[PDB]
Amino acid sequence: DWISFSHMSSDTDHFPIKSWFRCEQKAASRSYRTLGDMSHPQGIYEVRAAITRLISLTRGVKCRPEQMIIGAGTQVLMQLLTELLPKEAVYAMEEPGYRRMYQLLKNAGKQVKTIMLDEKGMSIAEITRQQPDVLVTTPSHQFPSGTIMPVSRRIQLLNWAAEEPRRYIIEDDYDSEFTYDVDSIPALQSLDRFQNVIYMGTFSKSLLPGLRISYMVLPPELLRAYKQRGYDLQTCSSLTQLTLQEFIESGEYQKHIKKMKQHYKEKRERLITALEAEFSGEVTVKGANAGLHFVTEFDTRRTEQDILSHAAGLQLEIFGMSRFNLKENKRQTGRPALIIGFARLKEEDIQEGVQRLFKAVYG
Amino acid sequence: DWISFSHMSSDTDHFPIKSWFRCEQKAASRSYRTLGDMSHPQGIYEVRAAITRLISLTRGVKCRPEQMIIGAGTQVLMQLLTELLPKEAVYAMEEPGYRRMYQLLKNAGKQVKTIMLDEKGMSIAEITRQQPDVLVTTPSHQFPSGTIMPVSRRIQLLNWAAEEPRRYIIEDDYDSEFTYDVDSIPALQSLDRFQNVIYMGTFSKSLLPGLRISYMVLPPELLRAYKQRGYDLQTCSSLTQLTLQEFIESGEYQKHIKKMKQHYKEKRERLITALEAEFSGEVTVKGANAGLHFVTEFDTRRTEQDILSHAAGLQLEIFGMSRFNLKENKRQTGRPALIIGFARLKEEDIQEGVQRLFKAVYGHR
Ligand SMILES: Cc1ncc(COP(=O)(O)O)c(CNCCCC(=O)O)c1O
Ligand SMILES: *Cc1c(COP(=O)(O)O)cnc(C)c1O
């Protein structure tokens, strides 16, 4: 009975789960003799090669498959990365941003500066002033604000990293697969002429988060630091990797993304239109030109926690922007701001969801 | 025409891949609408409940699913543990042992003591001497010497840990689904009255056709430490989790374990008979009646490296004890003690494998 405006979930109904299992039988019969065993620690080479081709095609990312590392989550690869990067590196994160990564870095004993955003995303002025060593950025659709970083700002960050040795940018290209605006913008890593960027990718938005498949691409110098480790074991089963590779090479991935691009586009249009009507125009929407969510701000007498406590009662799954407040202070000011995810939201349940949303906002 | 005496986990020839895939289907059907969600960070709860019920009756492990953390393999679970334990904790490991885990700890910048064995396992003598803060131990079937630590030694370790704060015992239970003849002695943590043991288990032996599924059971203090972080995400795919749960609860698992046990019971018997037949009083089989490996000591004038070198020339794959040293600096190998691993040993390969081993142990015949 719940309706879900979650940005963390997907509808199982639009994922071709039967194709996936069919690829799995194919991968299994292809590599039956050795499915049993562990893969190369970075992941199967042929599989790393398929991905390499994919992200070069879609994101213009330039690399050799040996630079790629596959892992069971962005957060296992982020941890590893903190061990490849200089021990005394000062990290910098978007504010607001991904609270888990913030917590991960702190718990690793790192200093994390918090960089505020402007209309173009991560503030280059703040970056220069604070002087961190490594930036963590989400250029395709800033998490959670949704700002698509323009190539002008991408170049600004790439010039910053070039100006001094041992500066790195971690490019978190999370939900970069769908675009409802001018066409794609090549990843920072592709615009880079000096190998200062670590490109991170995941299959959680395109596939299903249940499937724990992610990867990252290392500059050569960090790759040699990884290989010098010797003890690392792969975290994705051999069959999972081969199933993904089969899913992609068969073209099913390409079909799935193209179908979904259209599906999300139209569902996003519907949902917004229904927000503007039900709220009479008295709602502010931001970060809606890409990705699987946007941000909505309301004029109401209620606090964010009131709306959230109430929306929970109306059986509406929804999250407050306060969830993404990195630098702490008792400072909720202005309009309550909520993130509106729509991957998990049914076509049929848009009108009801907006009405439930209205009631939770106003009473 | 290679023959391998080097495997300690099965392969796809041994695994009912079809049963697994069919359980995966059913699990997926049952839990369709929830695949679009990411798991609970400790793993799906009802999965944790299933494993817990299982391990309580097979190993005598006493715990609640609330204390269990599921992960994509033992490495990732060990990595996390080092972050839950005191930063400046000193670790200690058995020698001979799992070198990979030695490097993991060393790369994490930890002090690691190396602790020799006697005929009851990890040396309490050496432990009370070298004074570490946390022990890493394989009490059910030592890796790779095969020693089953007796309860008297388990109690000594337990008492040791209880004596000062910030002392813990990691218990690596890795192949305890296979016990031959006499029933097993339960897991060490079944004796753990003061919450000093962290139980680490895996499905790598009893199953692994590549599956990355392990789990660890935490004492409340470390569990609270874990819940304090708030940033951890499950690494084991939700599909793998539900499948295994179905595999277990459908009964398919015990049926598999029952079959494999007899199969490995046969092979160990048939292999030891053959060793005793071609060698006689010249072979000593040291090791327990458990697991997928044992230790052979040879009464020969060849050195370990000689035998290993003649072994590769006869296309027989084996390892001597010296491989399982954790550390090395200015010394080398030893004298005829090899470990035999028979998880992937064809029955047809037994006599020929034993005949090559005989050749390599003298260089004649
Ligand atoms: C900022 C950011 N980057 C990457 C990911 C993908 O993570 P996995 O590869 O799936 O482990 C995510 C995923 N996050 C959803 C959680 C959002 C929340 O509100 O907690 C992410 O956010
Ligand atoms: C196989 C094994 C493990 C478990 O490793 P996984 O990460 O579960 O594959 C742990 N300890 C020892 C000694 C082993 O041989």
Are the C-beta atoms of A142 and A117 separated by less than 8 Å? yes
Cα dihedral sign, B294-B298-B302-B303? positive
Q: Angle CA(A75)–CA(A76)–CA(A79) in degrees, nearest 5? A: 85
Alpha carbons within 13 angstroms on the beta-carbon side of residue A331 total 5
Whether B212 and chain A come into contact, CB under 8 Å, resolves to yes
Identify all chain A residues contacting B233, using CB atoms and an 8 Å cutoff.
73, 75, 100
Q: Rounded distance, CA B357 to CA B320, Å?
A: 12
Q: Do β-strands B293-298 and B337-342 pair in parallel, antiparallel, or remain unpaired?
A: antiparallel
Identify all chain A residues contacting B214, using CB atoms and an 8 Å cutoff.
none
Helix (H, G, I), strand (E, B) or coil at B6: strand
Are the C-beta atoms of A198 and A222 separated by less than 8 Å? yes
Q: Rounded distance, CA B21 to CA A352, Å?
A: 39
> What tokens were used for A293?
């969510």
Q: Which residue has the tokens 């028979």?
A: B342
Beta bridge partners of A137: A171
The ligand 2 atom at the shortest distance from the C-alpha of residue B144 is 13
Question: Rounded to 10 degrees, what is the CA torsion of B254, B259, B263, B265?
Answer: 50
Question: Rounded to 10 degrees, what is the CA torsion of A105, B72, B173, B326?
Answer: -60
- What's the A81 CA to ligand 2 centre distance in angstroms? 24
> What tokens were used for B346?
């064809």
The bound ligand whose nearest atom lies closest to the alpha carbon of A77 is: 1
For the beta carbon of residue A226, count every other beta carbon within 10 angstroms. 18
Helix (H, G, I), strand (E, B) or coil at B173: strand
Q: Amino acid identity, residue B162?
A: A
Identify all chain B residues contacting A33, using CB atoms and an 8 Å cutoff.
12
- What's the A312 CA to ligand 2 centre distance in angstroms? 43
For B110, B357, B365, the CA distances from B278, given in Å and listed in that order, are 46, 9, 11
Closest CA relative to residue B213, chosen from B68, B338, B38, B74: B74
The CATH class that applies to domain B1-365 reads alpha beta
For the beta carbon of residue B128, count every other beta carbon within 10 angstroms. 12
Closest CA relative to residue A357, chosen from A264, A270, A271, A267: A271
Q: Rounded distance, CA B38 to CA B50, Å?
A: 19
Phi, psi (degrees; rounded to nearest 5) at B323:
-65, -30
CB pairs under 8 A between A and B: 127
Q: Which residue has the tokens 């970075």?
A: A42
For the beta carbon of residue B329, count every other beta carbon within 10 angstroms. 4
Q: Please give the resolution of this entry in Å, rounded to 1 decimal.
A: 2.0
Check A211 against B235: CB less than 8 A apart: no
* Residue B129 burial (10 A CB sphere; 0-12, 13-18, 19+): exposed
Whether A8 and chain B come into contact, CB under 8 Å, resolves to yes
Question: Chain centroid to CA A235: how far?
Answer: 20
Q: Which residue has the tokens 């070069």?
A: A56
Q: Rounded distance, CA B31 to CA B94, Å?
A: 43
Any idea what DSSP says for residue B280?
A: G
Provide the H-helix boundaries in B90-237.
99-107, 124-130, 151-162, 220-229
Check B35 against A72: CB less than 8 A apart: no
Phi, psi (degrees; rounded to nearest 5) at A172:
-80, 90
Domain ranges of chain A: 1-363
- What's the B296 CA to ligand 1 centre distance in angstroms? 50
Alpha-carbon gap: A12 to the closest alpha carbon of chain B (Å): 5
Cis amide linkage into residue A144, ω under 30° from 0 = yes
Are the C-beta atoms of B359 and B276 separated by less than 8 Å? no
Containing B54, the helix (H) or strand (E) segment is helix B45-58
For A10, B297, B343, the CA distances from B47, given in Å and listed in that order, are 21, 43, 28
Alpha carbons within 13 angstroms on the beta-carbon side of residue B336 total 20
Any idea what DSSP says for residue B27?
A: H
Interacting residues of B72 by C-beta distance below 8 A, sequence separation 6+ = A72, A212, A235, A236, B212, B213, B214, B235, B236, B237
Helices B238-249 and B45-58: crossing angle, nearest 10°? 40
Residue nearest to atom 5 of ligand 2 (CA): B74
Are the C-beta atoms of B115 and B94 separated by less than 8 Å? yes
Are the C-beta atoms of B6 and B319 separated by less than 8 Å? yes
Q: Rounded distance, CA B362 to CA B44, Å?
A: 55
Beta bridge partners of A338: A296, A320
We find that the CATH architecture of domain A1-363 is 3-Layer(aba) Sandwich (3.40)
Identify all chain B residues contacting A100, using CB atoms and an 8 Å cutoff.
230-231, 233
Q: Rounded distance, CA B281 to CA B299, Å?
A: 8
Closest CA relative to residue B44, chosen from A77, A210, A202: A210
* C-beta A204 within 6 A of ligand 1: yes
Alpha carbons within 13 angstroms on the beta-carbon side of residue A180 total 20
Closest CA relative to residue B121, chosen from B172, B82, B178, B58: B172
- What's the B75 CA to ligand 2 centre distance in angstroms? 8
Are the C-beta atoms of A85 and A168 separated by less than 8 Å? yes
Alpha-carbon gap: A199 to the closest alpha carbon of chain B (Å): 20
- What's the B42 CA to ligand 2 centre distance in angstroms? 20
Closest CA relative to residue A216, chosen from A229, A196, A201, A197: A201
Are the C-beta atoms of A36 and B208 separated by less than 8 Å? yes
Are the C-beta atoms of A234 and A303 separated by less than 8 Å? no
* C-beta A176 within 6 A of ligand 1: no
Closest CA relative to residue A283, chosen from A265, A300, A266: A300
For A149, B44, B190, B236, the CA distances from B201, given in Å and listed in that order, are 45, 17, 14, 14
Helix (H, G, I), strand (E, B) or coil at B342: strand
Interacting residues of B230 by C-beta distance below 8 A, sequence separation 6+ = A100, A103
Map chain A to HEC letters.
CCEECCCCCCCHHHCCHHHHHHHHHHHHHHCCCCCCCCCCCCCCHHHHHHHHHHHHHHHCCCCCHHHEEEECCHHHHHHHHHHHCCCCCCEEEEECCCHHHHHHHHHCCCCEEEEEEECCEECHHHHHHHCCCEEEECCCCCCCCCCCCCHHHHHHHHHHHHHCCCCEEEEECCCCCCECCCCCCCCHHHHCCCCCEEEEEECCCCCCCCCCCEEEECCHHHHHHHHCCCCCCCCCCHHHHHHHHHHHHCCHHHHHHHHHHHHHHHHHHHHHHHHHHHCCCCEEEECCCECCEEEEEECCCCCHHHHHHHHHHCCEECEEHHHHCCCCCCCCCCCCEEEEECCCCCCCCHHHHHHHHHHHHHC
Q: Which residue has the tokens 């200093």?
A: A111
Are the C-beta atoms of A122 and A135 separated by less than 8 Å? yes
Taking each continuous run of H as one helix and of E as one strand, the counts in chain B are: 11, 15
Closest CA relative to residue B171, chosen from B205, B107, B218: B218
Q: Which residue has the tokens 């604070």?
A: A130
Closest CA relative to residue B248, chosen from B46, B14, B35: B46
For the beta carbon of residue B183, count every other beta carbon within 10 angstroms. 6
